[PDB]
Design an enzyme around this catalytic site. Structure first.
Site, short mmCIF file in Angstrom:
data_model
loop_
_atom_site.label_atom_id
_atom_site.label_comp_id
_atom_site.label_asym_id
_atom_site.label_seq_id
_atom_site.Cartn_x
_atom_site.Cartn_y
_atom_site.Cartn_z
N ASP A 1 0.76 -1.19 0.00
CA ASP A 1 0.00 0.00 0.00
C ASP A 1 0.77 1.23 0.00
OD1 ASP A 1 0.10 -1.02 2.77
OD2 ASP A 1 -0.63 1.02 3.24
N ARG B 1 1.02 5.14 1.61
CA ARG B 1 0.60 5.68 2.85
C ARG B 1 -0.76 6.42 2.91
NH1 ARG B 1 -1.96 8.79 5.94
NH2 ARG B 1 -2.58 6.56 6.46
N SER C 1 -9.15 -0.64 -4.57
CA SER C 1 -9.29 0.77 -4.39
C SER C 1 -9.72 1.21 -5.76
CB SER C 1 -8.12 1.67 -3.94
OG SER C 1 -7.34 1.16 -2.86
N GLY D 1 -9.37 0.39 0.74
CA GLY D 1 -9.26 1.20 -0.49
C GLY D 1 -10.62 1.83 -0.80
N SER E 1 -2.04 10.65 -6.34
CA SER E 1 -2.85 10.79 -5.13
C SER E 1 -2.20 10.17 -3.93
CB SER E 1 -4.21 10.02 -5.28
OG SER E 1 -5.08 10.71 -6.17
N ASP F 1 2.06 6.61 -11.47
CA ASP F 1 1.06 6.98 -12.44
C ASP F 1 -0.04 7.88 -11.89
OD1 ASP F 1 0.43 6.34 -15.25
OD2 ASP F 1 -1.53 5.96 -14.32
N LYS G 1 -1.02 4.71 8.77
CA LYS G 1 -0.84 3.41 8.07
C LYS G 1 -2.17 3.24 7.39
CE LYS G 1 -0.42 0.56 11.57
NZ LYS G 1 0.05 -0.62 12.25
#
Lengths: 234, 246, 233, 238, 246, 219, 74, 51, 245, 249
Positions: free
Chosen positions: F17, F19, F129, F47, F169, F166, F33
């Site tokens: 993942d 952060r 997600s 997600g 966010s 890519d 986390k």
């Protein structure tokens, strides 16, 4: 499937001014397995007798020594069935608390919750109180903790306590053998000795369960580890 | 007063005695002995086994739907010892809970989850003075996933505990002490070996001496995901070996 | 021990036999149906002049043209009367006209016997009420007097007495009171019968009379009216 | 005794005396006779009152446009049960809209009456009911006990000193079946009078009739047409 | 609830037991007298058992149900205050008074509260496993009229209006002395009505101004509970009047 | 928003993942986390929308706790699936949580992806997600559909690193959560792809731009 | 009625007689010469030591008269 | 076979003397040999705790 | 014991040191009082033979009947108190009706029997209510589950039987079943047998007088629980009478 | 069955007492000394600490001194069992009142809510009454400093100085003898309370293990609820102990 329940007066005061049922419940816990709890101030150690008097019991997952949650555990003395519902109930309160706060329930908070249950069983009729005395352990918020809750619904604070058969002698042996400002190792050693002073005689590692409590969590040790300890004690 | 609390209430309803433990609760363990059924269960590493009477008393009673081995669910099965009325009642309640668990919770049901769940319920029955501490005892077999084959027995009192070997019934004390000698002089448990130990204990204790149509044996095997009765074919093959044993 | 719920070998319930006796304990009330109207007479039987005699009531209104005299435990009756007030106006909302003596009396009587001492709902009686009510009024149908019992047996009467003098008075009414006796004469008949159970003579502070007459609503007799019947007894 | 402390108290024989003792209450009640033909169901009843200077309030109750009842026993309890039955009969008329079956209605009373007799710390209902009802399978006259069992009779008499009346019912048992409305009512009166002493012979005032049948709905005659059935007097036939 | 065990069951004596047990508990003690004036109604209780160390300001044995309805209570035993028992009747009556004033724009009358006491006692009777309160209350208040009223209730739930009544330690004895003191001047002058309450209380046992607490209501204005210091001055003036008449 | 994946490999389960936890596409917090550690046996990746995912994991965790202790069986991923499907139905299909439950039973390690649907979905290897398909699409691409554990662990970390690159966010540290059924190794810094520039230079000021007329401590 | 464990008293003139009664039924002395017609209102009150099937062989229950039975009695 | 008794009738008293005598005769200082003594009971619970 | 005010027959939560429950046992003695109801399993159906008690002289058919239809293809014969039997009929019929609605296939007797037994058993446990004073048989034919016979007592047991009797004569009546081969046998022949057993067992003090009612549920009725024809009843009656002589 | 077992302790007696409240009244007397005295700047409670061993954790503030609110505190005479459920309930009630009103709750308002519950048990239900009688101490805006006592049916009385428990008559008479209606300050008020506890209690020098004393003092317009620590208590013991020494001479 048709009942309203019965609630009747054997659960009201006698003329003596003491409650008829509580005295009998205290008698049930005296008849039980001896159980010592010692707060080290370096962790809390709880010891009980594993045995049930036939050692044809599998107990590698069935224990007298059960974690409620990540670092709080209960050890009991007294009645086995009544304890089973109290273990299950206690967990349910712990997880409810766990949802809201994120920390597991403190020993101070947990006992009051459990105490209400003990109380319903005494005060309403057509029921009877639980006959189980609880040693509640935890290490949380920077201090290790030991609580007692007796069957009536009282909770008492002790730093070394003994239960069951020869509850009186255990409290005096604890006073004598264990002193303040000693370590965790010393605590573990003294509990098995209190159980020696509280039902005496032959011990195997399937006649004792010892569990240690820290912020790492409560764990009941494997049969081998308990065996090494035995040899130390007289 | 002596000879029961007749000027007192303590065997009339559920409330603690002057002596600690109830008369009524102790008395419930005496109702088991009435059933006429004695069950011996032996824990192995191939199957966990139950041996109980298939025994019928007439031409008029079925034996094609009368059994004391019950399929609670596929993996876990049980035997009931004692009062027949109470026996069915727990079996149905257990069956419904087993489906409901599997549906909602999604977890496969080990020996512990049925045993512990019933035991807590049978505590409520003991605790209420409307309901009575159970007339039957349930001895479960089923495969624990971590342990292996497991035999548990839950008390009509509401306590559950694990057993390598157990017995329940008319001769509760006699059979368990007999089986204790068999544990002590240990047997490396094969398939045939756990089945053999259970039948020799029961045959000696009742002193009838059973044959294969008179008993029905229940296994939950590590390759059978379902509960199966071994019936006469396998029992007779063991039965002769029992006479040759000692 | 034995319960109270049980039927006896006589063939009656215990609780109910006691409740009839409760009716007998209290003060006497007379309800006479005349065809000129229905009069209800009750004894005050005051023992102190510090009391205010208006506020000793034992005639309470079920309706605005039905009056009710009640006997036995005064308190026990009052609850039945409280429930009756709600039904009469309720009857006005639904039917769009006022309740009859018959309709109100059968509905309260259903409640009269329901008793189950143990394992019965707290919204239902553990014991029956020991009250006899006399519902007396003139309604759409005409003058009607209905009598209600604590046994929940309702029956139509023309002259009924209940209270300590209940059997004695009831016999004595059948004699004087007939339907060849006018309304004012009914008031004179009740007054004589009243005296044995009373501790003193009849007075206008020792009776309370109310008559509901055709074409009129319920009127509580004033001191002058009470005094005119006192003069000639 | 202590086979009747509560209605859960068994006798060693295996009988609850309180349910039996509840039947003795029905005997305290007023005499009612139930008779049927092949077109009518007829109920003949005794009304008593405390004032006989006033019209006697009916002992025939309304349940349906073709069902009427006559009570023997406890007056409050009979009315109490009557309301459960009335609610169901009128409901049956809304939903099913048949002329409801006497056998169907009567079993539902059997479930409710069983509740207190099953239940501790309670009394049975000690009232015996004779129901006349006409459905499209013809008349039925049913007797329901203080227990919960029913009889489908052609004729029945439950009430005070009902044995005397049965002696008549046993004697003209064949006759009931053929009758028209008039004939059913005259027999029930001749039966009804027997319960009572030799020297007492009924008046119309204390007789209420509930007539049910094929040619009629529900009509209660309190003195209305009571006088012709009464005529043709017969006085206490032994 | 589960409790339905009998506490009240009807007697062939034509009474309810609890109600009669309560009635004698107001015979045996806790003198409460009330007189009705012509502007003001005053009720008084004797005993809060001020032993000269107890508080007098915050203790209430006269409680305001409303601002135009007040009650003074009594029933005593070895458990001397049955303040607890009263406290229930007081709280339910308090809401009901206020409630009646929201719905019906007339200020609630004493006659409404008295029917409400008759139904509370009764309701407790009919409900299974429940028992009538022992209280008797002297309900004081003002109507729509603004007319002063004093009504008295009994433990059964039967109410009468009375100009002056005394209950406790011989209800009839205190009332018959007090009967002479009830005159046309006494009822007219407001100040004389305050003295009439105090003057009755003094007959049973004399002296104490701290033991005696009385509350006064004038018009539809709020309850005023008088200081004990006001009482002491008043008992001293009452004692001299007794010597004057006599 | 969030970029979470968990994998079934030839070893146990590796969760990867980024952060950042965002309330929408904007960061509420740049610390803590995203992949959460629960009891010792259960790890869950989170997600989609933050608000719906954290709370769902937490509520199921109590239920799962009760079931684990009583049954004394280790948690099953099929079991975990059913509990989320039933809970989310109870709520009435409010909010968006694509949840990654992964636990080790006594058999193999088992991994499931539960989207918010309230489905009984069995993956093969899944990433969640964002868009469920869009994350899932990567697994088919880099995994040959089974390779050795160490090779697979570098592989997930590399694929997750590409989604971080890519899609900006996700920000800060990439955490890898190696999950057994009593061992929860929370490696904060598997790869740090990006970090800020030092906030060395102030924007502080003396009082002469805003002043204070009080300094007191109430009692 | 022998359910004895009576730690306090329990009479036991009655105990001796209860045991002696069994002895006489036993075939130390005949029981083909002595027959016992026993009437007791209930068997609930009675203990199984007495009842057996070789102390009292037949168990004949007496239900309360039937409808026809009462006409015969009259 | 006796019990603790001591609130009983004259009948509970005589049983104990005999019950005392049996104890000493068996094992007390007196004991049997080849000869065997056989007891018969209905309940072993009616028996004295000492017996 | 039987005369007492606390526990024993008041309760059934009570246990004796033997283990007994006296109230549940008193309920059993109650089923015994009235005449016998037998129900015989065939490999093709169930045939009942019931004594239908004639309690008056003004009888009509179906009066105080003990034959009930639980489901379309289940019949129920009761023995013992009829008061308790009517409440039991409502509960059994209700469990079956809902079953048909949901499952859409003929109720398995093994399932229905488990549910009614649980209900009887809930009352025997309880000291709060008494338990039913009758014992019943449920008997059925289906091709989705076969011919089944079950029996439920006042205790709350359900076990299958292939030929059962409840009521006074049952120990005698049951013996006559061991004589007969009834597991394999047409429902036409078994009617003749249930009728002859009843006529001989009856005596004038178990009950005054009876009316013979036999019922079908088998190959003949085509899996329908119906009452036997006038013809069937009379020939089976005749054979009972001829065997009686 | 059920009524027979019910001892009918819920019945009224002719005299006008409830049997249960009277039997509860005795339960309070067995148990230790709890006394409250009024003073003019604060108010204090002194309760008997009955937990003496040399191995004590002290997981609670105290097992008899309970802070019910953030403006009330109380002490206990009776049974610890009843005290624990009750003490929790007293907290929800004190705390909800604090939310609505936002001012310290009257001592009188606090005893009354519970009273309904006490009464409920006794009259009907066949439920035991609580075995503790509570001395609540507080300051509320309206009266200033107050002390309230509750009994086993919720019978209430406002008291300047009162004592319940062991040697209740002795403690209250003695305290009546020196002090009558609020003649002393906060300093002197602690010294009397410990003195009374001293005579009543078997240990006649006390320590801080034997007594636990709690103060509730109004400072800077806000109620401070503090359980005093062992150190503060020893100072108070030496002050009374010394005063006793002069008495003799």
């Amino acid at each position: 499937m048709a009942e309203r329940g019965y609630s009747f007066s054997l659960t009201t005061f006698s003329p003596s001014g003491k409650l008829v049922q509580i005295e009998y419940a205290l008698a049930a816990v005296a008849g039980g397995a001896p159980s010592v709890g010692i707060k080290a101030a370096n962790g809390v150690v709880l010891a009980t007798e594993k045995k049930q008097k036939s050692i044809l019991y599998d107990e590698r997952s069935v224990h007298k020594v059960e974690p409620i949650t990540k670092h709080i555990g209960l050890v009991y003395s007294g009645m086995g069935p009544d304890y089973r519902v109290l273990v299950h109930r206690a967990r349910k309160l712990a997880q409810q608390y766990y949802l809201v706060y994120q920390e597991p329930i403190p020993t101070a908070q947990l006992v009051q919750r459990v105490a209400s249950v003990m109380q319903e069983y005494t005060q309403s009729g057509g029921v009877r109180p639980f006959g189980v005395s609880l040693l509640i352990c935890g290490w949380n918020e920077g201090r290790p903790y030991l609580f007692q809750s007796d069957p009536s619904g009282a909770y008492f604070a002790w730093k070394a306590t003994a239960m069951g058969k020869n509850y009186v002698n255990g409290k005096t042996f604890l006073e004598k053998r264990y002193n303040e400002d000693l370590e965790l190792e010393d605590a573990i050693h003294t509990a098995i000795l209190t159980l020696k002073e509280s039902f005496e005689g032959q011990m195997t590692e399937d006649n004792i369960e010892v569990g240690i409590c820290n912020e790492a969590g409560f764990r009941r040790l494997t049969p081998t580890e308990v065996r090494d300890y035995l040899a130390a004690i007289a | 007063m002596s000879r029961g609390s007749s000027a007192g209430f303590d065997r009339h309803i559920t409330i603690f005695s002057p002596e600690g433990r109830l008369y009524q609760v102790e008395y419930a363990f005496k109702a088991i002995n009435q059933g006429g059924l004695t069950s011996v269960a032996v824990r192995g590493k191939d199957c966990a086994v139950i041996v109980t009477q298939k025994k019928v008393p007439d031409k008029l009673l079925d034996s094609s739907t009368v059994t004391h081995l019950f399929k609670i669910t596929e993996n876990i099965g049980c035997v009931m010892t004692g009062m027949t009325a109470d026996s069915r009642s727990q079996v149905q309640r257990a069956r419904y809970e087993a489906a409901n668990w599997k549906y909602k919770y999604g977890y496969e049901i080990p020996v512990d989850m049925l045993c512990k769940r019933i035991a807590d319920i049978s505590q409520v029955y003991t605790q209420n003075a409307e309901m009575r501490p159970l007339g039957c005892c349930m001895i479960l077999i089923g495969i624990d996933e971590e342990q292996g084959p497991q035999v548990y027995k839950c008390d009509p009192a509401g306590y559950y505990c694990g057993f390598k070997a157990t017995a329940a019934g008319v001769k509760q004390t006699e059979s368990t002490s007999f089986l204790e000698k068999k544990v002590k002089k240990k047997f490396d448990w094969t398939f045939e070996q756990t089945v053999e130990t259970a039948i020799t204990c029961l045959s000696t204790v009742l002193s009838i001496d059973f044959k294969p149509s008179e008993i029905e044996v229940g296994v939950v095997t590590v390759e059978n995901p379902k509960f199966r009765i071994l019936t006469e074919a396998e029992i007779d093959a063991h039965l002769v070996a029992l006479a040759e044993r000692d | 021990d034995r319960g109270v719920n049980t039927f006896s070998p006589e063939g009656r319930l215990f609780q109910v036999e006691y409740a009839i006796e409760g009716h007998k304990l209290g003060s006497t009330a007379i309800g006479i149906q005349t065809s000129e109207g229905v009069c209800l007479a009750v004894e005050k039987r005051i023992t102190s002049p510090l009391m205010e005699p208006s506020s000793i009531e034992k005639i309470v209104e079920i309706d605005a043209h039905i009056g009710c005299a009640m006997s036995g435990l005064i308190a026990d009756a009052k609850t039945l009367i409280d429930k009756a007030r709600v039904e009469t106006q309720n009857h006005w909302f639904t039917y769009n006209e006022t309740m009859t003596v018959e309709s109100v009396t059968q509905a309260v009587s259903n409640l009269a016997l329901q008793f189950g001492e143990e394992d019965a709902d707290p919204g239902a009686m553990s014991r029956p009420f020991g009250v006899a009510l006399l519902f007396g009024g003139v309604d759409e149908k005409g003058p009607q007097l209905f009598h209600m019992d604590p046994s929940g047996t309702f029956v139509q009467c023309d002259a009924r007495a209940i209270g300590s003098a209940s059997e004695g008075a009831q016999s004595s009414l059948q004699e004087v009171y007939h339907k060849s006796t006018t309304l004012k004469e009914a008031i004179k008949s009740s007054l004589i019968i009243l005296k044995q159970v009373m501790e003193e003579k009849l007075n206008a502070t020792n009776i309370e009379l109310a008559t509901v007459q055709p074409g009129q609503n319920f009127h509580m007799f004033t001191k002058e009216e009470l005094e005119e019947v006192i003069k000639d007894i | 005794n202590q086979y009747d402390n509560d209605v859960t108290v068994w006798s060693p024989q295996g009988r609850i005396h309180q349910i039996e003792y509840a039947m003795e209450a029905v005997k305290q009640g007023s005499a009612t006779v139930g008779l049927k033909s092949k077109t009518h169901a007829v109920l003949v009843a005794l009304k008593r009152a405390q004032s006989e200077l006033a019209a006697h309030q009916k002992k025939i109750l309304h349940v349906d446009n073709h069902i009427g009842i006559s009570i023997a026993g406890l007056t409050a309890d009979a009315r109490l049960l009557c309301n459960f039955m009335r609610q169901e009969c009128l409901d049956s008329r809304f939903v099913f809209d048949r002329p409801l079956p006497v056998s169907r209605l009567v079993s539902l009373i059997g479930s409710k009456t069983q509740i207190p007799t099953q239940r501790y710390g309670r009394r049975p209902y000690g009232v015996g009911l004779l129901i006349a009802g006409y459905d499209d399978m013809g008349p039925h006259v049913f007797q329901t006990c203080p227990s919960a069992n029913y009889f489908d009779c052609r004729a029945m008499s439950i009430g005070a000193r009902s044995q005397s009346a049965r002696t008549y019912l046993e004697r003209h048992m064949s006759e009931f079946m053929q009758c028209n409305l008039d004939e059913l009512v005259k027999h029930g009166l001749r039966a009804l009078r027997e319960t009572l002493p030799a020297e007492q012979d009924l008046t119309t005032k204390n007789v209420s009739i509930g007539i049910v049948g094929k040619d009629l709905e529900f009509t209660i005659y309190d003195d209305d047409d009571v006088s012709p059935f009464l005529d043709g007097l017969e006085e206490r036939p032994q | 609830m589960s409790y339905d065990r009998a506490i009240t069951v009807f007697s062939p004596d034509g009474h309810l037991f609890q109600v009669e047990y309560a009635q004698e508990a107001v015979k045996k003690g806790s003198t409460a007298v009330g007189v009705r004036g012509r502007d003001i109604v005053v009720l008084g209780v004797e005993k809060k058992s001020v032993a000269k160390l107890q508080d007098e300001r915050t203790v209430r044995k006269i409680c305001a149900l409303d601002d135009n309805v007040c009650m003074a209570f009594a029933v005593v035993a070895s458990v001397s205050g049955l303040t607890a028992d009263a406290r229930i009747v007081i709280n339910r009556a308090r809401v009901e008074c206020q409630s009646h004033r929201l719905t019906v724009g007339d200020p609630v009358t004493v006659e409404y509260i008295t029917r409400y006491i008759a139904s509370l006692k009764q309701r407790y009777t009919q409900s299974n496993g429940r028992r009538p309160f022992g209280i008797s209350a002297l309900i004081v208040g003002f109507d729509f009229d603004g007319t002063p009223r004093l009504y008295q209730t009994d433990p059964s739930g039967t109410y009468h209006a009375w100009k002056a009544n005394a209950i406790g330690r011989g209800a009839k004895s205190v009332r018959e002395f007090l009967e002479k003191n009830y005159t046309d001047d006494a009822i007219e002058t407001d100040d004389l009505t305050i003295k009439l309450v105090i003057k009755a209380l003094l007959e049973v046992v004399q002296s104490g101004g701290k033991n005696i607490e009385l509350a006064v209501m004038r018009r539809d204005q709020p309850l005023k509970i008088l200081s004990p210091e006001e009482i002491e001055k008043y008992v001293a003036e009452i004692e001299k009047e007794k010597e004057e008449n006599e | 928003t969030t970029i979470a994946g968990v994998v079934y490999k030839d070893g146990i389960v590796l969760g990867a993942d980024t952060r950042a936890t965002e309330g929408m596409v904007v960061a509420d917090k740049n610390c803590s986390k995203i992949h959460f550690i629960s009891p010792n046996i259960y790890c869950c990746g989170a997600g989609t929308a933050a608000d719906t995912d954290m709370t769902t994991q937490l509520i199921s965790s109590n239920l799962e706790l009760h079931s684990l202790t009583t049954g004394r069986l280790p948690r099953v991923v099929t079991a975990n699936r059913m509990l989320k499907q039933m809970l989310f139905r109870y709520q009435g299909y409010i909010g968006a949580a694509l949840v990654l439950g992964g636990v080790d039973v006594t058999g193999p390690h088992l991994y499931s992806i539960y989207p918010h649907g309230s489905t009984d979905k069995l993956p093969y290897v899944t990433m969640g997600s964002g868009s469920l398909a869009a994350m899932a699409v990567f697994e088919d691409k880099f995994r040959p559909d089974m390779e050795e554990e160490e090779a697979k662990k570098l592989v997930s970390e590399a694929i997750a690193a590409g989604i971080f690159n890519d899609l900006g966010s996700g920000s800060n540290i990439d955490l890898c959560v190696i999950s057994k059924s009593k061992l929860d190794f929370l490696r904060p810094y598997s790869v740090p792809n990006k970090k800020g520039t030092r906030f060395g230079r102030y924007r502080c000021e003396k009082g002469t731009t805003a002043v204070l007329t009080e300094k007191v401590t109430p009692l | 009625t022998k359910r004895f464990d009576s730690e306090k008293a329990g009479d036991r003139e009655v105990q001796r007689t209860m045991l002696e009664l069994l002895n006489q039924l036993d075939g130390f002395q005949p029981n083909t010469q002595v027959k016992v017609i026993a009437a007791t209102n209930r068997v609930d009150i009675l203990d199984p030591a007495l009842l057996r099937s070789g102390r009292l062989d037949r168990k004949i229950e007496f239900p309360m008269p039937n409808e026809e039975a009462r006409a015969r009695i009259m | 076979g006796g019990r603790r008794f001591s609130e009983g009738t004259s009948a509970d008293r005589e049983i104990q003397r005999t019950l005392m005598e049996l104890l000493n005769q068996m094992d007390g200082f007196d004991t049997l040999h080849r000869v065997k003594m056989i007891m018969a009971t209905n309940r072993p619970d009616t028996l004295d705790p000492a017996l | 014991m039987s005369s007492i005010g606390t526990g024993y027959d008041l309760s059934a939560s009570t246990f004796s040191p033997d283990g007994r429950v006296f109230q549940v046992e008193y309920a059993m003695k109650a089923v015994e009082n009235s005449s016998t109801a037998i129900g015989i399993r065939c490999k093709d159906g169930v045939v009942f033979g019931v004594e239908k008690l004639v309690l008056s002289k003004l009888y009509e058919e179906g009066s105080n009947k003990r034959l009930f239809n639980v489901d379309r293809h289940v019949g129920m014969a009761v023995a013992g108190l009829l008061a308790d039997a009517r409440s039991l009929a409502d509960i059994a019929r209700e469990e079956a009706s809902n079953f048909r609605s949901n499952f859409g296939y003929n109720i398995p007797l093994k399932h229905l029997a488990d549910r009614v037994a649980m209900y009887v058993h809930a009352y025997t446990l309880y000291s709060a209510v008494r338990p039913f004073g009758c014992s019943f048989m449920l008997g059925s034919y289906s091709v989705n589950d076969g011919a089944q016979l079950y029996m439920i007592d006042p205790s709350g047991v359900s076990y299958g039987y292939w030929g059962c009797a409840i009521g006074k004569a049952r120990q005698a009546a049951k013996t006559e079943i061991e004589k007969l081969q009834m597991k394999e046998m047409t429902c036409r022949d078994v009617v003749k047998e249930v009728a002859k057993i009843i006529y001989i067992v009856h005596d004038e003090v178990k009950d005054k007088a009876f009316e013979l009612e036999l019922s079908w549920v088998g190959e003949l009725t085509k899996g329908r629980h119906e009452i036997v024809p006038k013809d069937v009843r009379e020939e089976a009656e005749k054979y009972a009478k001829e065997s009686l002589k | 069955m059920s009524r027979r077992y019910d001892s009918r302790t819920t019945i009224f007696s002719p005299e006008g007492r409830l049997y249960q409240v009277e039997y509860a009244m005795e339960a309070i007397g067995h148990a230790g000394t709890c006394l409250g005295i009024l003073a003019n700047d604060g108010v204090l409670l002194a309760a008997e600490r009955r937990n003496i061993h040399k191995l004590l954790d002290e997981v609670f503030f105290s097992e008899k001194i309970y802070k019910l609110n953030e403006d009330m505190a109380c002490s206990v005479a009776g049974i610890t069992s009843d005290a624990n459920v009750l003490t929790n309930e007293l907290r929800l009630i004190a705390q909800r009142y604090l939310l609505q009103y936002q001012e310290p709750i009257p001592c009188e308002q606090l005893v009354t809510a519970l009273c309904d519950i006490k009464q409920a048990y006794t009259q009907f239900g066949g439920k035991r009454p609580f075995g503790v009688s509570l001395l609540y101490i507080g300051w509320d805006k309206h009266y200033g400093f107050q002390l309230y006592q509750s009994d086993p049916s919720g019978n209430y009385g406002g008291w300047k100085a009162t004592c319940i428990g062991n040697n209740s008559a002795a403690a209250v008479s003695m305290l009546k003898q020196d002090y009558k209606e609020g003649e002393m300050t906060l300093k002197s008020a602690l010294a009397l309370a410990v003195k009374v506890l001293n005579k009543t209690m078997d240990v006649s020098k006390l320590s801080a293990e034997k007594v636990e004393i709690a103060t509730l003092t109004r400072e800077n317009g806000k109620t401070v609820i503090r359980v005093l620590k062992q150190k503060e208590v020893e100072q108070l013991i030496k002050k009374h102990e010394e005063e006793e020494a002069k008495a003799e001479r």
